[PDB]
Design a protein around this motif. Sequence first.
Motif, PDB file in Angstrom:
ATOM      1  N   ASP A  62      28.810  68.080 -36.677  1.00 24.60           N
ATOM      2  CA  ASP A  62      29.164  68.272 -38.071  1.00 24.60           C
ATOM      3  C   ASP A  62      27.947  68.475 -38.930  1.00 24.60           C
ATOM      4  O   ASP A  62      26.869  67.983 -38.612  1.00 24.60           O
ATOM      5  CB  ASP A  62      29.903  67.052 -38.589  1.00 24.60           C
ATOM      6  N   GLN A  63      28.161  69.209 -40.012  1.00 24.90           N
ATOM      7  CA  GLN A  63      27.237  69.271 -41.128  1.00 24.90           C
ATOM      8  C   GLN A  63      27.301  67.919 -41.854  1.00 24.90           C
ATOM      9  O   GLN A  63      28.189  67.687 -42.652  1.00 24.90           O
ATOM     10  CB  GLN A  63      27.597  70.450 -42.056  1.00 24.90           C
ATOM     11  N   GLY A  64      26.359  67.031 -41.557  1.00 21.30           N
ATOM     12  CA  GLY A  64      26.457  65.640 -41.973  1.00 21.30           C
ATOM     13  C   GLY A  64      25.288  65.142 -42.779  1.00 21.30           C
ATOM     14  O   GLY A  64      24.169  65.566 -42.584  1.00 21.30           O
ATOM     15  N   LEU A  65      25.562  64.231 -43.695  1.00 19.84           N
ATOM     16  CA  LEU A  65      24.527  63.523 -44.409  1.00 19.84           C
ATOM     17  C   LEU A  65      24.778  62.033 -44.273  1.00 19.84           C
ATOM     18  O   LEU A  65      25.895  61.595 -44.474  1.00 19.84           O
ATOM     19  CB  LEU A  65      24.536  63.929 -45.879  1.00 19.84           C
ATOM     20  N   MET A  66      23.739  61.270 -43.932  1.00 21.93           N
ATOM     21  CA  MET A  66      23.847  59.828 -43.808  1.00 21.93           C
ATOM     22  C   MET A  66      22.659  59.122 -44.407  1.00 21.93           C
ATOM     23  O   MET A  66      21.569  59.663 -44.479  1.00 21.93           O
ATOM     24  CB  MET A  66      23.967  59.382 -42.347  1.00 21.93           C
ATOM     25  N   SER A  75      27.027  57.845 -35.212  1.00 15.84           N
ATOM     26  CA  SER A  75      25.786  57.623 -34.440  1.00 15.84           C
ATOM     27  C   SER A  75      24.506  57.665 -35.273  1.00 15.84           C
ATOM     28  O   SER A  75      23.632  56.816 -35.096  1.00 15.84           O
ATOM     29  CB  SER A  75      25.700  58.616 -33.273  1.00 15.84           C
ATOM     30  N   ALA A  76      24.429  58.634 -36.193  1.00 14.74           N
ATOM     31  CA  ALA A  76      23.260  58.809 -37.053  1.00 14.74           C
ATOM     32  C   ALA A  76      23.222  57.841 -38.208  1.00 14.74           C
ATOM     33  O   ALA A  76      22.134  57.514 -38.674  1.00 14.74           O
ATOM     34  CB  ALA A  76      23.195  60.228 -37.580  1.00 14.74           C
ATOM     35  N   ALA A  77      24.394  57.395 -38.691  1.00 21.02           N
ATOM     36  CA  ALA A  77      24.485  56.246 -39.624  1.00 21.02           C
ATOM     37  C   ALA A  77      23.843  55.006 -39.007  1.00 21.02           C
ATOM     38  O   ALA A  77      23.090  54.288 -39.672  1.00 21.02           O
ATOM     39  CB  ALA A  77      25.934  55.944 -39.993  1.00 21.02           C
ATOM     40  N   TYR A  78      24.121  54.776 -37.721  1.00 24.27           N
ATOM     41  CA  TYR A  78      23.496  53.647 -37.011  1.00 24.27           C
ATOM     42  C   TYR A  78      21.988  53.862 -36.807  1.00 24.27           C
ATOM     43  O   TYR A  78      21.219  52.937 -36.976  1.00 24.27           O
ATOM     44  CB  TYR A  78      24.179  53.379 -35.676  1.00 24.27           C
ATOM     45  N   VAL A  87      22.007  58.460 -28.989  1.00 22.55           N
ATOM     46  CA  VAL A  87      23.014  57.762 -28.173  1.00 22.55           C
ATOM     47  C   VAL A  87      22.376  57.063 -26.963  1.00 22.55           C
ATOM     48  O   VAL A  87      22.804  55.981 -26.574  1.00 22.55           O
ATOM     49  CB  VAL A  87      24.193  58.677 -27.725  1.00 22.55           C
ATOM     50  N   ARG A  88      21.349  57.690 -26.386  1.00 28.81           N
ATOM     51  CA  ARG A  88      20.543  57.074 -25.348  1.00 28.81           C
ATOM     52  C   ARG A  88      19.785  55.870 -25.877  1.00 28.81           C
ATOM     53  O   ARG A  88      19.901  54.804 -25.297  1.00 28.81           O
ATOM     54  CB  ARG A  88      19.567  58.085 -24.734  1.00 28.81           C
ATOM     55  N   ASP A  89      19.019  56.025 -26.964  1.00 28.44           N
ATOM     56  CA  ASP A  89      18.209  54.903 -27.491  1.00 28.44           C
ATOM     57  C   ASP A  89      19.071  53.721 -27.934  1.00 28.44           C
ATOM     58  O   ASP A  89      18.737  52.578 -27.644  1.00 28.44           O
ATOM     59  CB  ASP A  89      17.270  55.339 -28.634  1.00 28.44           C
TER      60      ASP A  89
END
Lengths: 360, 365
Positions: free
Chosen positions: B109-113, B263-266, B331-333
């Motif tokens: 997605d075109q995402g912003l976090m 995932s990127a929020a985390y 997701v790996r880290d």
Amino acid sequence: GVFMFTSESVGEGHPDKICDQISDAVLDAHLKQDPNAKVACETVCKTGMVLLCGEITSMAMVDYQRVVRDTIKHIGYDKGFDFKTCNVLVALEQQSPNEEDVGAGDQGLMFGYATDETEECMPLTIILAHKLNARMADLRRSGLLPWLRPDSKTQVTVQYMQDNGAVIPVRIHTIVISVQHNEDITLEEMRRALKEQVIRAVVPAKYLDEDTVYHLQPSGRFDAGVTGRKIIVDTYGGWGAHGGGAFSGKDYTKVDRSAAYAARWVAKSLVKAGLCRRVLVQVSYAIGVAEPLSISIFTYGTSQKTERELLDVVHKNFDLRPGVIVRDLDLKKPIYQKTACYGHFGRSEFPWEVPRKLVF
Amino acid sequence: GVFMFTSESVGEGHPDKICDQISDAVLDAHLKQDPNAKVACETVCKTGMVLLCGEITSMAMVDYQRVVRDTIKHIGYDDSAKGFDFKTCNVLVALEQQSPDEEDVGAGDQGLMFGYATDETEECMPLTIILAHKLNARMADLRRSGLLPWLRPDSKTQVTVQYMQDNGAVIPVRIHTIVISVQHNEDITLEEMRRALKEQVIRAVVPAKYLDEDTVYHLQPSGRFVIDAGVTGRKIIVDTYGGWGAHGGGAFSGKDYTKVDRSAAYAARWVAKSLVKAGLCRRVLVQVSYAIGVAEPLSISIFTYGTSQKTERELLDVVHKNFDLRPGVIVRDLDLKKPIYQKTACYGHFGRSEFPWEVPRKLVF
């Protein structure tokens, strides 16, 4: 400092937005007859089914089936959905029944935001996202793009320059649009039309260039809805901050709505008066207390005057007790349906969007 | 300047949170059997009726009735007296489940976090949201231990802290107000309940040095609460920073790790917290933006609220040299295929040191 920022808007036909709008149509139907109506209306929908829940204290006589069905028709389902044949299940319970010094009903925290980067004192990202969806709705309703259906999602990414706290839009980085459609129309025809009739018409050409990325109908050819789940879309598209309060289906007695509107009003007035280029206004309320606990003004470094100076200006020019806000913003009027899509902020036809002349 | 700030939390039995928690139990059920399951599970609930909607691509063979009912039981709804019961409730499953057939995979997605952190608490989280969460967890503990058997699962807390500004940092001075509403059995009075909330919940959780004789207490403010519509993804601020920082709009629960919104929020949390624990700033908002089908972030912005000696550009440098924020590497880290999502779905996604995004990375700079 170059950064990119993305905001989203969803169409009137998005199920969460169907519910917001229906909920505020019911609010308005009561306010037309009885301005003292109290209305907590939650709508839920799931393909062929609309459920109105909540509590109403009002003297109005509201034909709920007509209101809901008229709202569904207005949205454009007449597609997986129809106003003549959908199940409208009305569960809500209508009982029957200081002034400016009544305490806040909740322990509320609300933010107001303004930026000088647009005419509407709003972030370009969210304005462009709302306007693209409105443009499609206009083209659908007028019969000019008859293949369009009411559900859509648009995302706009704007590439920005920082300017000592202010933010300057430089270019459109990416636009994403998906929209529901009739079968007799090609992928290429839809993409041509979206680029030419929607995007070119809405987005100032100076922001568009040869590298702007266009994801139009990205997943080729096209869940449950509830009220009050599109709170970022409804406000600032990720800019500023949000305390958590949804708006739709809440009447003027709910500080989460009325004081959010007022917070916006303050922020917009501060930018319009030339006292800052950008501002976050934070106002907190205590249960049963009229006067806010605190007001914080953050100008991102864009004011000559200090926070405390701006606060004194706010005190001189505004009275943010819930009861006075309702009066000053005329919030018992049946105007809430119009707020339920295309954002609650940025549209000059609302009273919280008419800047207050500041004496300082 | 002095200011007041309020954050909210809701307990495991609040209907919106019942849904978040069911949606993530479904996610976990799937991930135990198929680490690569695609899950987009929305839960709705209204008076004895739970509805599972959405789309799952997975090899997993899941007993939906059992997962939903185990979750409801675990939350603590086990009899008709509470207005809701895992035995007699209708779990209406509408999911369409299908079957299926790398570090540089593009964002879906075109995402912003946003990630946010602050030195005001040991958890690097705002005191207002941390207390709100701990007050709800404390009640849940005392309900399950039998120490306050009148307690029921649904609840709502609000914590107003009075703060002082400090060169962009924020220091908590005192607790200005606490609001607690909690569901309960019939044979307890409002007066007993209030006393117990003061003495066994509030005194146990909130540090003594913040409470004073002017602290306001609104305990069971709407009176009795013996016995309503819920959905997934409607406690987005409760789930994150409680009004602090900012929010791009993406809800977490019911979504597998291939949704960048989660995932990127985390990862953004992880980065923010890492910066504060390194001593590089006292307070930080991190903003990261993604484009569909592109792995690398388009931009990473870092606002320290005037609390860092290093500049934004210099702190960005540190993040570039210490983190790889491509979705595939995140997701790996952060071990994001591990089935621990049900745990994130109440008491907040941020602040609890048992999650990989809450273990700061030692930063080379």
